[PDB]
Homo-oligomer: A and B are copies of this chain.
Amino acid sequence: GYTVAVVGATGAVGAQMIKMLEESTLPIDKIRYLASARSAGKSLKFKDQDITIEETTETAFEGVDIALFSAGSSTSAKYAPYAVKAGVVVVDNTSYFRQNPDVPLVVPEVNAHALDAHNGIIACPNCSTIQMMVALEPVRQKWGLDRIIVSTYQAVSGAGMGAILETQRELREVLNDGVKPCDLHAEILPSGGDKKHYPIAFNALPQIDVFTDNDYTYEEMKMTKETKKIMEDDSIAVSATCVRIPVLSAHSESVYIETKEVAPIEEVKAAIAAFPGAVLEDDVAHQIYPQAINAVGSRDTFVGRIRKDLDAEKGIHMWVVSDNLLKGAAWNSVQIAETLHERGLVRPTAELKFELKLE
């Protein structure tokens, strides 16, 4: 079996990494939980076992076979290259390594083939990108993709445990204390790192991550760039609007595509139904469509409201929902580790291709 380390074990994604590993088929001989100095020495369960949390350091990875990182980009930048140097295979949930040509950016149902040539780091894409890829890959395979326009409806757990707590607190102040949403004080959302913070309670914030120099946010540009890499087609036009709404878990997306060939809607429904990891929930006569509250706790990606554009011959609209902590993060990561195991790819990488940041 394997020694598996979870880096960022105490966070929103980490708690789901634990759950997904507890439910995994991976043969695990030893579990280690790593986080910051803040959590070092505390205890968390793995099944019935008590695991002492360790501070993440450059020397923490000896004997580790697989390390799952979900502790922020700076933590992956600082420590994943040392883990690789030590002989680990890293599955990274952060954005840091996603666009590195030496790093596979993987959704196992879409581009598992990319895992074979890994160099010790496999990156999980952005949560909003992953579920979109599950929905759209079966369509691309049969009718091609020319462009995508997507507007997202993103849950706050996307921004971490602090953001969940902020949202719950804000809602309680409004609903129990009678505070006006405009009078709420926020510390984290829309973006922990940015300069100004706004209430999410009873609001919709059209900012996820920070702004880039083209006036799209980093979240929007990640959807664009990650789609192109995952589908191995730079010619797919993708523009996004990413919005935070008052949902704790599960992202929803209004997705418009134009295909290369006309894709009959009944065939599109069938293709998605048949695609691993995607579930068709589309029966408007009985008001059946994906819903965030129904998707929570499931590894599947749910697709419905599928219909042709009213004017563009090759245009199709749909609604895509998945638990952003599961398929959008921890489940994609554990699924990657399981796929690495299936393919005999859990072993050290001889040549280091990633800069060491702590020399």
Measured CB to CB, the residues of A under 8 A from B are 147, 149, 151, 153, 168, 171-172, 175-176, 180-182, 190, 194-196, 198-199, 201-207, 211, 214-216, 224, 237-239, 241, 243, 245-249, 252, 254, 256, 284-287, 289-294, 296, 304-305, 307, 309-312, 315, 317, 319, 321
Q: Once the chains are docked, how many angstroms separate the CA of A304 from the CA of B241?
A: 12
Q: Once the chains are docked, how many angstroms separate the CA of A254 from the CA of B319?
A: 15
Question: 9 A-B contacts, Cβ less than 8 Å apart?
Answer: A171-B171, A175-B175, A198-B291, A202-B293, A203-B291, A207-B287, A211-B284, A245-B247, A246-B247
Q: Once the chains are docked, how many angstroms separate the CA of A211 from the CA of B243?
A: 26
Residues of B within 8 A of A239 (CB): 256, 309-312, 315, 317
A323 to chain B, nearest CB (A): 12
Residue pair A246, B211 in contact (C-beta under 8 Å):
no
Residues of B within 8 A of A190 (CB): 287
Residues A252 and B204 in contact in the complex (CB < 8 Å), given A196-B286, A291-B198, A293-B181: yes
Residues of B within 8 A of A315 (CB): 239
Residue pair A293, B203 in contact (C-beta under 8 Å):
yes
Residues of B within 8 A of A292 (CB): 202-204
Residue pair A206, B252 in contact (C-beta under 8 Å):
yes
Residues of B within 8 A of A317 (CB): 239, 241
Closest to A286 in B: B196
Residues of B within 8 A of A286 (CB): 195-196
Q: Once the chains are docked, how many angstroms separate the CA of A315 from the CA of B258?
A: 15
A288 to chain B, nearest CB (A): 9
Residue pair B241, A319 in contact (C-beta under 8 Å):
yes
Q: Once the chains are docked, how many angstroms separate the CA of A227 from the CA of B147?
A: 25
Residue pair A293, B199 in contact (C-beta under 8 Å):
yes
Given contacts A194-B287, A204-B245, A243-B252, 16 further A-B contacts (CB under 8 A): A149-B149, A149-B256, A149-B309, A151-B151, A151-B241, A153-B204, A153-B243, A172-B175, A180-B293, A182-B296, A196-B287, A198-B287, A202-B246, A204-B247, A204-B321, A206-B254
Residues of B within 8 A of A284 (CB): 211, 215
Residues of B within 8 A of A305 (CB): 206, 215, 241
Residue pair B168, A202 in contact (C-beta under 8 Å):
no
Residue pair B153, A245 in contact (C-beta under 8 Å):
yes
Point out the residue from B180, B243, B312 that lies within 8 Å of A254, measured CB to CB.
Answer: B243
A272 to chain B, nearest CB (A): 15
Residue pair B206, A289 in contact (C-beta under 8 Å):
yes
Residues of B within 8 A of A168 (CB): 175
A230 to chain B, nearest CB (A): 17
Residue pair A147, B205 in contact (C-beta under 8 Å):
no
Closest to A206 in B: B319
A314 to chain B, nearest CB (A): 13
Residues of B within 8 A of A181 (CB): 293, 296
Residues A248 and B202 in contact in the complex (CB < 8 Å), given A307-B215, A310-B239: yes
Residues of B within 8 A of A201 (CB): 293
Residue pair B214, A307 in contact (C-beta under 8 Å):
yes
A158 to chain B, nearest CB (A): 14
Q: Once the chains are docked, how many angstroms separate the CA of A96 from the CA of B237?
A: 40
Q: Once the chains are docked, how many angstroms separate the CA of A149 from the CA of B168?
A: 33
Residues of B within 8 A of A198 (CB): 287, 291
Residues A311 and B147 in contact in the complex (CB < 8 Å), given A171-B171, A175-B175, A211-B284: yes
Residue pair A216, B294 in contact (C-beta under 8 Å):
no
